[PDB]
Design a protein around this ligand. Sequence first.
Ligand SMILES: c1ccc2ccccc2c1
Ligand SMILES: c1ccc2ccccc2c1
Ligand SMILES: c1ccc2ccccc2c1
Ligand code: FES
Ligand code: FES
Ligand code: FES
Ligand SMILES: [Fe+3]
Ligand SMILES: [Fe+3]
Ligand SMILES: [Fe+3]
Lengths: 193, 193, 193, 447, 447, 447
Amino acid sequence: MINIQEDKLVSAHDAEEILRFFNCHDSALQQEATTLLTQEAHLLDIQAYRAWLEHCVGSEVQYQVISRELRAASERRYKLNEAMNVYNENFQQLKVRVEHQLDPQNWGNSPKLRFTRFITNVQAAMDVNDKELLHIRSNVILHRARRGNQVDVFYAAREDKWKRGEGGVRKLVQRFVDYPERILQTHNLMVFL
Amino acid sequence: MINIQEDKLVSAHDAEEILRFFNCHDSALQQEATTLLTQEAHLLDIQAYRAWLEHCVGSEVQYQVISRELRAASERRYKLNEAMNVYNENFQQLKVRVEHQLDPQNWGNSPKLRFTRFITNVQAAMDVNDKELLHIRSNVILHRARRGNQVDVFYAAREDKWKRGEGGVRKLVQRFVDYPERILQTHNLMVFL
Amino acid sequence: MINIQEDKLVSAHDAEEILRFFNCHDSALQQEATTLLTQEAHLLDIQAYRAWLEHCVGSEVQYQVISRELRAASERRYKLNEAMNVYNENFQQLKVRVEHQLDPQNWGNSPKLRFTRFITNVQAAMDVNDKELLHIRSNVILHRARRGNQVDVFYAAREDKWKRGEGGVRKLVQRFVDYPERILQTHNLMVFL
Amino acid sequence: MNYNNKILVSESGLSQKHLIHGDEELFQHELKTIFARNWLFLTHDSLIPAPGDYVTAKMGIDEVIVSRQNDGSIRAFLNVCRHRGKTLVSVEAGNAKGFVCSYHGWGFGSNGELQSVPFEKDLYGESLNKKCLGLKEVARVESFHGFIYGCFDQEAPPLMDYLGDAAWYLEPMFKHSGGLELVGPPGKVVIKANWKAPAENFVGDAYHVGWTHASSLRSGESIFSSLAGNAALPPEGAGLQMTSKYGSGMGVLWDGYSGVHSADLVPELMAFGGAKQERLNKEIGDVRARIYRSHLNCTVFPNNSMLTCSGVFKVWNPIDANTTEVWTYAIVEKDMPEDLKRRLADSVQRTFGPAGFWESDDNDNMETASQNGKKYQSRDSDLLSNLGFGEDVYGDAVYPGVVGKSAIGETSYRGFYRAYQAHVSSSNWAEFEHASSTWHTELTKTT
Amino acid sequence: MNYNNKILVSESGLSQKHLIHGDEELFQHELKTIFARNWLFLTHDSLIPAPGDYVTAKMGIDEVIVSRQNDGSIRAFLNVCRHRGKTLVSVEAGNAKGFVCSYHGWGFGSNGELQSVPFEKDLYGESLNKKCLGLKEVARVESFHGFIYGCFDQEAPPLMDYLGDAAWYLEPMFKHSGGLELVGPPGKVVIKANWKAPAENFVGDAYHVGWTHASSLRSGESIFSSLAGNAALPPEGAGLQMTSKYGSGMGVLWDGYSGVHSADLVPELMAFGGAKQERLNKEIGDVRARIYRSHLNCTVFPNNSMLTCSGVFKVWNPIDANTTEVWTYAIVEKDMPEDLKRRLADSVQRTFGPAGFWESDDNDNMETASQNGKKYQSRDSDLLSNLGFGEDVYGDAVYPGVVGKSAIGETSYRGFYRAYQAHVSSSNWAEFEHASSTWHTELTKTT
Amino acid sequence: MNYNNKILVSESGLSQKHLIHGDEELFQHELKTIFARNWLFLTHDSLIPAPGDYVTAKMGIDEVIVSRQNDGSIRAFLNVCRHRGKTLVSVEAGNAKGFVCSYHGWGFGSNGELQSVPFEKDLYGESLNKKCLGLKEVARVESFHGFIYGCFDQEAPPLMDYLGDAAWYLEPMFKHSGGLELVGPPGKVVIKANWKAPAENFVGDAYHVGWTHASSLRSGESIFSSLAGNAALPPEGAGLQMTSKYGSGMGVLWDGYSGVHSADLVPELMAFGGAKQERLNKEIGDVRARIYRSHLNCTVFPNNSMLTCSGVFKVWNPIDANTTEVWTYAIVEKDMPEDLKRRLADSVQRTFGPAGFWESDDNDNMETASQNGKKYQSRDSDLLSNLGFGEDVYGDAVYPGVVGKSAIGETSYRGFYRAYQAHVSSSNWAEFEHASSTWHTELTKTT
Ligand SMILES: c1ccc2ccccc2c1
Ligand SMILES: c1ccc2ccccc2c1
Ligand SMILES: c1ccc2ccccc2c1
Ligand code: FES
Ligand code: FES
Ligand code: FES
Ligand SMILES: [Fe+3]
Ligand SMILES: [Fe+3]
Ligand SMILES: [Fe+3]
């Protein structure tokens, strides 16, 4: 419904994603998506990272978080790599990160970290071409507290694809986040958004 | 159900608004309201401001955000203007603001800003007198990131009236926000709450 | 479904709580819980503390917020008190706090404080043993603004038990919060989470 | 830094060291030599009209209580208890006959006097000399047509003399219009800029309007809207610039009575202003009547700025070298119809308030200019203010002050900064006067 | 600022310059002359009872590890690795025989010694002198009935002598009750106040209670609840105030054993305290037995405060001139029944902890008083502490120290601040002693 | 502090005062004597290959625009308008023939020249000397095989001479491999550490790897993964350490071409590096060919670090004594297959980027070590860097510089810190040279 020639600030990508949700609205899918994401966030908040991989993450996953370079709104000639990958993980790479979290020589995890996730603005729509692919959009606030007085708060929109896998369980097959802050003021981005 | 003589901190306005939601609860209206607001926030987050005006904002809108002067809880004599209007916009005034956002000489919009909105605590009730007027209450966290290391976070409760307009689409006819921070620490309030 | 021998960072308590929600999911209970908590938060945000006690809080309530001492992840010998109670209130103790809020000589309440609560990630499940006991889990962001330029933001997960009481109204009988920040950077924790 | 000898502002105000917008030691020095010495905006009669009415205000980084006395005068006092130093008043406005401290309950009157102390007889007996324990009073409080200013320095010139040649320009609107009202409460927003950045912008910066505000001009369709994107330079004779001995200055854009207001208010304002001007021609003369309905962008030194006709009124409250708390009020003419007063006030905030689309255009300009004054390679660099130098006059037969008979220039910057140098390098008002005895000659060199 | 000559505290402690609560240079100077010189609270035996038990604590802005040694003594060390300076221990409490650095793996014993270095033989050979690389040790660590204090200055007086005349007042509860336990972990909250603001409030401020805490008194229905809103001044003889040479001081409110505890605990406490007092009469005499069950509001100079009977125990940990980290523990008598110990601890935190409804009443008082010390017009202003001056005595036959035989006054402020001046103006303990040779005479002038 | 005489770094670089990581006055002094004096990394040819391409970069706390000129050279300018000091460019990269200021519209070319001023003729006439108003230019801009460095000091040695003996080690990868590309954009993250903490870690800290990174080694299964938990000390002869006159230094871990990359990339990298080494043996000799495919952990003084083979490239941008902005790029060999370049870049960010699991291991190490330098009892303490002292050589027949023929040691710290002392105590390059005339003798004492 958006025309990006008129709505000058809107990217083609964003206009495409909008279109998926404004058409076929199914209140039931929205509810299923809310449950999936709330359960995922609970597992992550209690640091059940193995459980998260087992129950929420698909074997063919791409888990991607980008940082886009600041360019002029009117830029048209400079064509070099627009973004870097903070995360661009397959299942094995996620597993490595999970093992790193769980290793008892991960000194930064003692004392235990505290995570609290807030998931909002859930939207869900089935893919037009692949009847088994569910598109889910949601926003997250992630609060990380450690070592008495360190507090880091992360904010992001997540563009996901979820598909039924082993046992008929819907699992994450793609997560894409375009991280909104260019220069991070949270010490690192070592959290699963 | 609130008696403000007993519940001494509660304003008459707030007591009146509570009453609308505690009585007739309709889970279906709550769902419709959640969709409306999630769609609105998506359009705003991708900076589809023209689309927002076209799809979400009614021609008779009043879009109002106030800043109330700090007065003594026991004040009774001083009767001068209690608040100022940060926003008090009709449709044409909103359109002016939208044109200002979209103008390619709006230097502050390059590089492109990043917005992420979190909408929670949605309540909805039909008006008792006007069967076509929907009251919606919701809270928003709005995260604005620009220029590498500028990050501003806004928090507010929104008291809205939505009514079906052209094409039977429910559109915003009144938004009222009493902004909770008296002195803004976000550089400006140049965001649509 | 979590095995804490494998998922090394997960506490027994957290594993137990997960289990309640992954089994019997009832979308209707989730909706009732969302309404209860949204109404509770509205009453608190408008500072209708008497109304909150009357409508939302059960006579047998335990309202508890702990601060856990930072200990080594590998600690096994030191066995002294693990946490302190920021709150550990019965109904009468809550009533005292409410009277303190409402007293016109509470100088810190003039000018009037401004509260905005954001409730997310609601989960609900009936207790397996007591058919009248509802377990509700939710996360809260609480924004407190006062005196022009003071702004404090609180983040927490809440583990509640709600039960039907007088008039068949579901009321809070237990709230438990393990506050995630060890050293508070919000001046005090004088808010009802 | 030795402020007796350090050249922060070059001869004739032609340039300033960039560090002045970033240096924290200088900021502390300005508290003494600028804020504790000069006249600072407090409030308007319209905000404290009745006995007992009070407001709080900042004077520099200090907070004061400003109170209407029973005899009709106004007095101001530090908002600090004389016992253990707690802030006395925590609200912004109200009506009271006194203020009680919430720490130990000491009670002070609206006149600053210590009136009661809990259990005085049992505790202090007759030992407490209450007459010496009144709130610390602002030495000087004076009115310019209802606009109330304060000064901590008893040696300062009277407010009217301090306004110098700028007063002549303000009088048509402030006095001859029948008077102005300030509509509160103000908007309040913190920006990461030095207070001098918006002060200099409002005192003399017409050059930036067409470029900085290209989008606001284009989108609002206001009267100054031709300049969008520097599409057009105003005519010769479209206005002028002026400055004065004590630093206050302004630009004059002839006839622009609707100012920044969007097309929705232009017809009504242009009608109202022109009708009043017609009556004023017979009273104050054609030139002054035209000044009344001309847009003045002014800074009353050091940190109070305004746009007459647009009705914007600002206080740039200093917090630290790169932090300022911006207060925005609307000014309206008392004899305007109420509905028009309401719409104008909303329009002031729409354009220049916390969500002011115009004011937002200036954010990055002020913030980065200020923050760059901290950066090592820029501290000793020179900010330029030479536009129009050698074409300014003094003692003109029609327009007083040091005047540049052009709408766009930097005359007002030069006078703001010559006043600032003189203060920063002086220990008291006598020394400022000695350093300013040839103020206008310095400003008109090469002409 | 020349702290040898600057009069920050006037003669007899009668007033203090407001800047002392805001000046960052002074704060840095206090790290040297207050925090590195004096005795600071670390922990209690009850928190590290067994060999290997340890806790971390702040001493000024430094962090130390406090560890129970195998021989039963306690030693404390800076929580900083001797290699490249990483913080060694990241938890608050535990049990260990040593601490390994997570940077390069150096291992130190519970006794501070450098015990191992990874690959020592291959890397350092025999070149590393490990005996000179033990953790930097806190020179002095001493106990007052289980309460463990530390001092970086080997020249300090013994802790008991440092307590001076205040010790006599604490002993009934600390010693003759059978002993106290500290119940951890503490609450921890940061306030935007200078550490001296809560220190002075607890050392000597009974005046504020009725007004500041009007709402908490009214709502809780505790024993001191008549004073709500200054509805009633306590009787003559309801208590007294005292201060000492090294700055520690306290108020005594006779018989108030239930303290700030709400009506739910009043009967049980008043019964328990009175029963113990009956036994103590025969052991320490009626006056001291009554002191045992009397509410003492005390500050152990510089920054440790307590309310006996209420069981509140605080550490005001300095961060910067307007930031303090407040640690709140509960104190309980060891021979109280367990269930009572639990309820008292919860009540301490209910009233004075992170969500303490009483402590919240003091927030604005402390924060604004402190922040106002930064404001230009207030820096050189005088905070007053003259209540009761000229009625204090020294060398009384029954009550030792400099004593004001009234429940409400500022005696304890004057002694806290005379000690503070003497330290801030002295380079070492010998100079403090020379500056304090007529301490009590100075405090009792005009009597 | 008198930096002429203050011993911040002891003889031979054996120790440093902990305050150097915390002292804000010293930080300001480093802006002058380190950042305004020495060579600082700007960009790579691969990021601005075409005329008009530009990027912004930090040089110390200053921001500069780095632009490819039409003639193929690169020039850099302060990102500050010459009029009123606004930041000129608000994006990180782009292509343009000039930059227009959004305040008053002044337009500067890609060559720094002031090319246009709005309404110049009407406003300035011929009075504006535009040739003197070009952007403030970075005096020196030089390339090391495509890596572009800048220096504000015209007196500095040429970049190649500044690299000193370190250049010999970098050349196999930087020159003889066919050349490197930097893959942007960088990750950018702020850490609460002093810039010297990561600079020293990368220049010479192999000791920490096995312990700090125990979890990353174990979990990633990379080539250096035996050392996890200090399970194994590398063989004798597993590498060496070197340092140079102007402070740059590095560790060499022989043959570790796959570096920190996880097992997924190890086989492909070890194959690629070894194949190239085979060709290089005939061109630069066996030793240099082996250096090409050996892991070098290097800091180019002061604040640019890299891990060759791993392909990590960092800039530790100083903000204040305990704040640094970390920029992370990937380096790849130009002749690697594209798909391999992509996977390597992602792996660099996976391990060492904003969510780098390895880099996260170092967070607490750097932050607490730095913050502890502010703590009172630690300011005057000595950070130790004596590992390997008395076994270093200079002038070796095979390996140049001051060299420790061991994989793990502190040789490179000592040379970094002797260079740092010499600068901090010198007013210009001539004085640095005079203070460095026996640099290597100082570093090899006791051998
Ligand atoms: C600042 C300075 C001069 C002006 C002239 C017209 C309109 C707005 C202005 C803002
Ligand atoms: C501070 C100082 C004195 C007191 C006396 C009684 C109760 C609470 C107090 C708090
Ligand atoms: C810093 C310093 C040396 C290293 C050697 C190998 C791998 C990573 C490193 C990081
Ligand atoms: S501080 Fe105001 S009465 Fe004591
Ligand atoms: S810093 Fe502790 S072992 Fe190196
Ligand atoms: S500040 Fe750049 S053109 Fe004026
Ligand atoms: Fe402007
Ligand atoms: Fe108190
Ligand atoms: Fe490392």
